[PDB]
Amino acid sequence: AAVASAYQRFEPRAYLRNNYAPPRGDLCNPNGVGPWKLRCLAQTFATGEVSGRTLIDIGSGPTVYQLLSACSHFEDITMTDFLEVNRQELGRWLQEEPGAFNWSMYSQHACLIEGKGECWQDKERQLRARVKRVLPIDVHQPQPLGAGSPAPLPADALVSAFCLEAVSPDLASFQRALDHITTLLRPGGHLLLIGALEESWYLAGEARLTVVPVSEEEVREALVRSGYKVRDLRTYIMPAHLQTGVDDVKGVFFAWAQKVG
Numbered sequence: 001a002a003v004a005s006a007y008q009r010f011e012p013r014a015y016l017r018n019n020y021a022p023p024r025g026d027l028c029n030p031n032g033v034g035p036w037k038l039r040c041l042a043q044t045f046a047t048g049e050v051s052g053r054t055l056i057d058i059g060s061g062p063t064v065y066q067l068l069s070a071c072s073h074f075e076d077i078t079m080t081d082f083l084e085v086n087r088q089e090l091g092r093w094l095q096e097e098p099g100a101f102n103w104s105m106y107s108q109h110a111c112l113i114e115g116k117g118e119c120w121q122d123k124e125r126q127l128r129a130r131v132k133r134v135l136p137i138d139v140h141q142p143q144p145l146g147a148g149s150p151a152p153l154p155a156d157a158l159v160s161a162f163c164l165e166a167v168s169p170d171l172a173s174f175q176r177a178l179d180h181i182t183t184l185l186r187p188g189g190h191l192l193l194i195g196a197l198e199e200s201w202y203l204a205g206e207a208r209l210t211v212v213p214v215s216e217e218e219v220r221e222a223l224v225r226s227g228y229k230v231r232d233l234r235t236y237i238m239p240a241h242l243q244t245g246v247d248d249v250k251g252v253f254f255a256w257a258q259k260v261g
Protein backbone atom coordinates (compact mmCIF):
# COMPACT_ATOMS: atom_id res chain seq x y z
CA ALA A 1 0.00 0.00 0.00
CA ALA A 2 3.06 2.21 0.51
CA VAL A 3 4.15 1.89 -3.12
CA ALA A 4 0.50 1.78 -4.25
CA SER A 5 0.15 5.12 -2.45
CA ALA A 6 3.05 6.72 -4.32
CA TYR A 7 1.67 5.56 -7.67
CA GLN A 8 -1.36 7.70 -6.97
CA ARG A 9 0.56 10.80 -8.03
CA PHE A 10 1.96 9.04 -11.12
CA GLU A 11 1.61 11.34 -14.17
CA PRO A 12 1.29 9.33 -17.45
CA ARG A 13 2.44 12.20 -19.66
CA ALA A 14 5.38 13.01 -17.41
CA TYR A 15 6.41 9.34 -17.54
CA LEU A 16 6.14 9.25 -21.34
CA ARG A 17 8.12 12.47 -21.64
CA ASN A 18 10.91 11.31 -19.31
CA ASN A 19 11.41 7.95 -21.02
CA TYR A 20 9.88 7.88 -24.50
CA ALA A 21 10.73 11.35 -25.87
CA PRO A 22 14.31 12.49 -26.68
CA PRO A 23 17.02 11.82 -25.71
CA ARG A 24 16.03 8.33 -24.55
CA GLY A 25 13.22 8.21 -27.05
CA ASP A 26 15.47 9.08 -30.01
CA LEU A 27 15.39 6.02 -32.26
CA CYS A 28 17.82 7.34 -34.87
CA ASN A 29 20.97 6.46 -32.92
CA PRO A 30 21.52 2.69 -33.20
CA ASN A 31 23.36 2.76 -29.85
CA GLY A 32 20.34 4.07 -27.97
CA VAL A 33 18.30 2.04 -25.49
CA GLY A 34 15.29 2.31 -27.78
CA PRO A 35 16.67 0.45 -30.78
CA TRP A 36 18.20 -2.07 -28.34
CA LYS A 37 14.89 -2.88 -26.66
CA LEU A 38 13.04 -3.16 -29.98
CA ARG A 39 15.73 -5.52 -31.36
CA CYS A 40 15.55 -7.86 -28.37
CA LEU A 41 11.78 -8.09 -28.79
CA ALA A 42 11.89 -8.45 -32.59
CA GLN A 43 14.71 -11.01 -32.69
CA THR A 44 12.99 -13.12 -30.07
CA PHE A 45 9.67 -13.33 -31.92
CA ALA A 46 11.52 -13.80 -35.21
CA THR A 47 12.78 -17.16 -33.94
CA GLY A 48 9.19 -18.31 -34.31
CA GLU A 49 9.34 -20.10 -30.96
CA VAL A 50 7.09 -17.62 -29.15
CA SER A 51 3.64 -18.29 -30.58
CA GLY A 52 0.08 -18.92 -29.47
CA ARG A 53 -3.35 -17.30 -29.45
CA THR A 54 -3.41 -15.23 -26.28
CA LEU A 55 -0.92 -12.84 -24.72
CA ILE A 56 -1.08 -10.59 -21.67
CA ASP A 57 0.98 -7.45 -21.15
CA ILE A 58 1.63 -6.95 -17.42
CA GLY A 59 1.82 -3.38 -16.14
CA SER A 60 1.53 -1.89 -19.62
CA GLY A 61 1.39 1.61 -18.19
CA PRO A 62 0.75 4.19 -20.96
CA THR A 63 2.99 2.51 -23.52
CA VAL A 64 2.55 0.10 -26.44
CA TYR A 65 6.05 -0.28 -27.99
CA GLN A 66 6.45 -3.51 -26.03
CA LEU A 67 3.77 -5.12 -28.19
CA LEU A 68 4.77 -3.90 -31.67
CA SER A 69 6.65 -7.05 -32.65
CA ALA A 70 4.46 -9.36 -30.58
CA CYS A 71 1.10 -8.39 -32.08
CA SER A 72 1.65 -10.41 -35.27
CA HIS A 73 2.03 -13.65 -33.31
CA PHE A 74 -1.01 -13.40 -31.04
CA GLU A 75 -4.59 -12.72 -32.14
CA ASP A 76 -5.96 -11.99 -28.67
CA ILE A 77 -3.94 -9.46 -26.69
CA THR A 78 -4.76 -8.19 -23.22
CA MET A 79 -3.10 -5.06 -21.83
CA THR A 80 -3.10 -4.18 -18.15
CA ASP A 81 -2.23 -1.69 -15.42
CA PHE A 82 -2.83 -0.74 -11.81
CA LEU A 83 -3.62 2.87 -12.67
CA GLU A 84 -6.88 4.07 -14.16
CA VAL A 85 -5.00 7.05 -15.64
CA ASN A 86 -2.73 4.70 -17.58
CA ARG A 87 -5.58 2.56 -18.88
CA GLN A 88 -7.19 5.84 -19.93
CA GLU A 89 -4.04 6.87 -21.82
CA LEU A 90 -3.84 3.50 -23.59
CA GLY A 91 -7.46 3.90 -24.63
CA ARG A 92 -6.73 7.23 -26.27
CA TRP A 93 -4.18 5.54 -28.54
CA LEU A 94 -6.09 2.34 -29.21
CA GLN A 95 -9.20 4.36 -30.11
CA GLU A 96 -7.12 6.97 -31.96
CA GLU A 97 -8.77 9.59 -29.74
CA PRO A 98 -7.48 13.17 -29.31
CA GLY A 99 -4.21 13.68 -27.46
CA ALA A 100 -3.04 10.10 -27.81
CA PHE A 101 0.73 9.73 -27.46
CA ASN A 102 2.47 9.48 -30.84
CA TRP A 103 4.14 6.07 -31.20
CA SER A 104 4.64 6.30 -34.97
CA MET A 105 8.44 6.50 -34.57
CA TYR A 106 8.53 3.19 -32.66
CA SER A 107 6.12 1.52 -35.08
CA GLN A 108 8.41 2.57 -37.93
CA HIS A 109 11.50 1.22 -36.23
CA ALA A 110 9.81 -2.07 -35.38
CA CYS A 111 9.01 -2.35 -39.10
CA LEU A 112 12.56 -1.38 -39.99
CA ILE A 113 14.07 -3.90 -37.58
CA GLU A 114 11.70 -6.74 -38.44
CA GLY A 115 12.57 -6.30 -42.12
CA LYS A 116 9.34 -7.63 -43.64
CA GLY A 117 8.65 -4.57 -45.78
CA GLU A 118 5.63 -3.75 -43.63
CA CYS A 119 4.46 -0.12 -43.44
CA TRP A 120 4.04 1.31 -39.93
CA GLN A 121 0.32 2.07 -40.41
CA ASP A 122 -0.42 -1.63 -40.99
CA LYS A 123 1.63 -2.45 -37.88
CA GLU A 124 -0.31 -0.03 -35.68
CA ARG A 125 -3.52 -1.24 -37.33
CA GLN A 126 -2.76 -4.86 -36.43
CA LEU A 127 -1.88 -4.06 -32.81
CA ARG A 128 -5.02 -1.96 -32.28
CA ALA A 129 -7.06 -4.78 -33.79
CA ARG A 130 -5.61 -7.50 -31.60
CA VAL A 131 -5.73 -5.69 -28.26
CA LYS A 132 -9.15 -6.89 -27.09
CA ARG A 133 -9.09 -5.34 -23.61
CA VAL A 134 -7.26 -3.08 -21.14
CA LEU A 135 -7.74 -4.52 -17.64
CA PRO A 136 -6.80 -3.44 -14.09
CA ILE A 137 -4.21 -5.61 -12.35
CA ASP A 138 -2.12 -5.83 -9.18
CA VAL A 139 0.90 -8.10 -9.31
CA HIS A 140 0.91 -8.05 -5.51
CA GLN A 141 -2.23 -10.20 -5.42
CA PRO A 142 -1.90 -14.02 -5.64
CA GLN A 143 -4.43 -13.63 -8.45
CA PRO A 144 -3.15 -10.50 -10.31
CA LEU A 145 -6.14 -10.07 -12.61
CA GLY A 146 -8.70 -11.20 -10.07
CA ALA A 147 -11.51 -13.76 -9.86
CA GLY A 148 -13.64 -13.47 -12.98
CA SER A 149 -11.30 -11.62 -15.33
CA PRO A 150 -12.44 -11.24 -18.97
CA ALA A 151 -8.93 -12.37 -19.94
CA PRO A 152 -8.39 -15.81 -21.49
CA LEU A 153 -6.40 -17.83 -18.96
CA PRO A 154 -3.95 -19.34 -18.88
CA ALA A 155 -2.19 -17.09 -21.39
CA ASP A 156 0.03 -18.57 -24.10
CA ALA A 157 2.61 -15.90 -23.33
CA LEU A 158 3.37 -12.89 -21.15
CA VAL A 159 5.22 -9.63 -21.72
CA SER A 160 6.23 -7.27 -18.90
CA ALA A 161 8.40 -4.19 -19.11
CA PHE A 162 9.64 -2.14 -16.16
CA CYS A 163 6.86 -3.27 -13.86
CA LEU A 164 7.95 -5.77 -11.21
CA GLU A 165 11.05 -3.96 -9.98
CA ALA A 166 9.16 -0.66 -10.18
CA VAL A 167 6.44 -1.87 -7.82
CA SER A 168 8.40 -4.02 -5.38
CA PRO A 169 10.06 -2.51 -2.26
CA ASP A 170 12.64 -5.31 -2.13
CA LEU A 171 13.84 -8.54 -3.72
CA ALA A 172 11.42 -10.85 -1.90
CA SER A 173 8.46 -8.80 -3.11
CA PHE A 174 9.94 -8.96 -6.63
CA GLN A 175 10.02 -12.75 -6.39
CA ARG A 176 6.45 -13.12 -5.16
CA ALA A 177 5.20 -10.63 -7.74
CA LEU A 178 6.88 -12.85 -10.32
CA ASP A 179 5.25 -15.99 -8.90
CA HIS A 180 1.95 -14.13 -8.95
CA ILE A 181 2.10 -13.33 -12.67
CA THR A 182 3.64 -16.69 -13.52
CA THR A 183 0.38 -18.41 -12.54
CA LEU A 184 -1.25 -16.51 -15.42
CA LEU A 185 1.06 -18.31 -17.84
CA ARG A 186 0.29 -21.75 -19.20
CA PRO A 187 2.97 -24.43 -18.72
CA GLY A 188 5.45 -24.44 -21.58
CA GLY A 189 4.50 -20.81 -22.12
CA HIS A 190 6.83 -17.87 -22.65
CA LEU A 191 7.64 -14.76 -20.66
CA LEU A 192 9.43 -11.76 -22.13
CA LEU A 193 10.61 -9.61 -19.25
CA ILE A 194 12.26 -6.21 -19.63
CA GLY A 195 13.38 -4.03 -16.74
CA ALA A 196 15.71 -1.56 -15.07
CA LEU A 197 19.01 -2.75 -13.62
CA GLU A 198 20.32 -1.45 -10.30
CA GLU A 199 17.73 1.35 -10.21
CA SER A 200 16.43 2.72 -6.90
CA TRP A 201 14.05 5.53 -7.91
CA TYR A 202 12.44 7.24 -10.91
CA LEU A 203 10.24 10.28 -11.38
CA ALA A 204 6.84 10.53 -13.04
CA GLY A 205 5.76 14.12 -12.50
CA GLU A 206 4.92 14.88 -8.87
CA ALA A 207 5.34 11.18 -8.14
CA ARG A 208 8.69 9.88 -6.91
CA LEU A 209 8.77 6.08 -7.00
CA THR A 210 11.04 3.82 -5.01
CA VAL A 211 12.54 0.93 -6.97
CA VAL A 212 14.19 -2.30 -5.90
CA PRO A 213 17.67 -2.30 -7.44
CA VAL A 214 18.27 -5.72 -9.00
CA SER A 215 21.18 -7.25 -10.90
CA GLU A 216 21.25 -9.54 -13.91
CA GLU A 217 22.02 -12.58 -11.70
CA GLU A 218 19.23 -11.70 -9.28
CA VAL A 219 16.80 -11.60 -12.21
CA ARG A 220 18.08 -14.91 -13.56
CA GLU A 221 17.84 -16.62 -10.16
CA ALA A 222 14.39 -15.11 -9.59
CA LEU A 223 13.19 -16.48 -12.94
CA VAL A 224 14.56 -19.94 -12.11
CA ARG A 225 13.01 -19.98 -8.64
CA SER A 226 9.70 -19.21 -10.31
CA GLY A 227 9.97 -22.24 -12.56
CA TYR A 228 11.40 -20.81 -15.79
CA LYS A 229 14.12 -21.96 -18.15
CA VAL A 230 16.14 -18.87 -19.06
CA ARG A 231 16.42 -18.95 -22.85
CA ASP A 232 18.02 -15.52 -23.15
CA LEU A 233 19.10 -12.73 -20.79
CA ARG A 234 20.93 -9.67 -22.12
CA THR A 235 22.07 -6.41 -20.56
CA TYR A 236 22.24 -2.90 -21.95
CA ILE A 237 24.47 -0.48 -20.06
CA MET A 238 22.99 3.03 -19.93
CA PRO A 239 25.36 5.43 -21.73
CA ALA A 240 26.27 8.74 -20.08
CA HIS A 241 24.02 10.92 -22.27
CA LEU A 242 20.98 8.81 -21.44
CA GLN A 243 21.61 9.49 -17.77
CA THR A 244 19.28 12.37 -17.13
CA GLY A 245 17.73 13.48 -13.87
CA VAL A 246 14.61 11.34 -14.27
CA ASP A 247 16.10 8.34 -12.46
CA ASP A 248 19.28 6.52 -11.47
CA VAL A 249 18.95 3.44 -13.71
CA LYS A 250 22.31 1.81 -14.49
CA GLY A 251 21.23 -0.51 -17.28
CA VAL A 252 18.32 -2.41 -18.78
CA PHE A 253 17.83 -6.16 -18.98
CA PHE A 254 15.96 -8.36 -21.43
CA ALA A 255 14.83 -11.81 -20.41
CA TRP A 256 13.18 -14.47 -22.55
CA ALA A 257 12.03 -17.20 -20.19
CA GLN A 258 10.01 -20.37 -20.75
CA LYS A 259 7.77 -21.81 -18.03
CA VAL A 260 9.07 -25.36 -17.86
CA GLY A 261 6.04 -27.29 -16.72
Ligand SMILES: Nc1ncnc2c1ncn2[C@@H]1O[C@H](CSCC[C@H](N)C(=O)O)[C@@H](O)[C@H]1O
Nearest residue numbers: 059060061082083137138139161162166167
Ligand atom coordinates in the same frame (compact mmCIF):
# COMPACT_ATOMS: atom_id res chain seq x y z
N1 LIG B 1 0.75 -3.34 -7.98
C1 LIG B 1 0.92 -3.13 -9.29
N2 LIG B 1 0.63 -4.15 -10.16
C2 LIG B 1 0.81 -3.93 -11.49
N3 LIG B 1 1.24 -2.80 -12.12
C3 LIG B 1 1.51 -1.82 -11.22
C4 LIG B 1 1.37 -1.91 -9.84
N4 LIG B 1 1.71 -0.73 -9.20
C5 LIG B 1 2.05 0.07 -10.18
N5 LIG B 1 1.94 -0.54 -11.46
C6 LIG B 1 2.19 0.04 -12.78
O1 LIG B 1 3.44 -0.40 -13.25
C7 LIG B 1 3.92 0.55 -14.25
C8 LIG B 1 5.41 0.80 -14.12
S1 LIG B 1 6.04 1.87 -15.44
C9 LIG B 1 6.22 0.69 -16.78
C10 LIG B 1 5.31 1.04 -17.95
C11 LIG B 1 5.55 0.25 -19.25
N6 LIG B 1 5.43 -1.18 -18.99
C12 LIG B 1 6.90 0.60 -19.89
O2 LIG B 1 7.53 -0.32 -20.46
O3 LIG B 1 7.30 1.78 -19.85
C13 LIG B 1 3.02 1.78 -14.14
O4 LIG B 1 2.16 1.86 -15.27
C14 LIG B 1 2.28 1.56 -12.83
O5 LIG B 1 0.99 2.14 -12.78
Ligand SMILES: O=S(=O)(NCCC(F)(F)F)c1ccc2c(c1)CN[C@@H](CF)C2
Nearest residue numbers: 019020024025033034162166196202249
Ligand atom coordinates in the same frame (compact mmCIF):
# COMPACT_ATOMS: atom_id res chain seq x y z
O1 LIG C 1 15.21 4.31 -21.11
S1 LIG C 1 14.50 3.06 -21.10
O2 LIG C 1 15.26 1.85 -21.03
N1 LIG C 1 13.63 2.98 -22.46
C1 LIG C 1 13.12 4.23 -23.05
C2 LIG C 1 13.64 4.55 -24.43
C3 LIG C 1 12.98 3.91 -25.62
F1 LIG C 1 11.66 4.10 -25.65
F2 LIG C 1 13.37 4.39 -26.81
F3 LIG C 1 13.12 2.58 -25.70
C4 LIG C 1 13.46 3.07 -19.67
C5 LIG C 1 12.08 2.94 -19.79
C6 LIG C 1 11.30 2.96 -18.64
C7 LIG C 1 11.87 3.10 -17.38
C8 LIG C 1 13.26 3.24 -17.27
C9 LIG C 1 14.04 3.22 -18.42
C10 LIG C 1 13.92 3.35 -15.89
N2 LIG C 1 12.92 3.66 -14.86
C11 LIG C 1 11.81 2.69 -14.91
C12 LIG C 1 11.00 2.73 -13.61
F4 LIG C 1 10.06 1.77 -13.61
C13 LIG C 1 10.98 3.08 -16.14
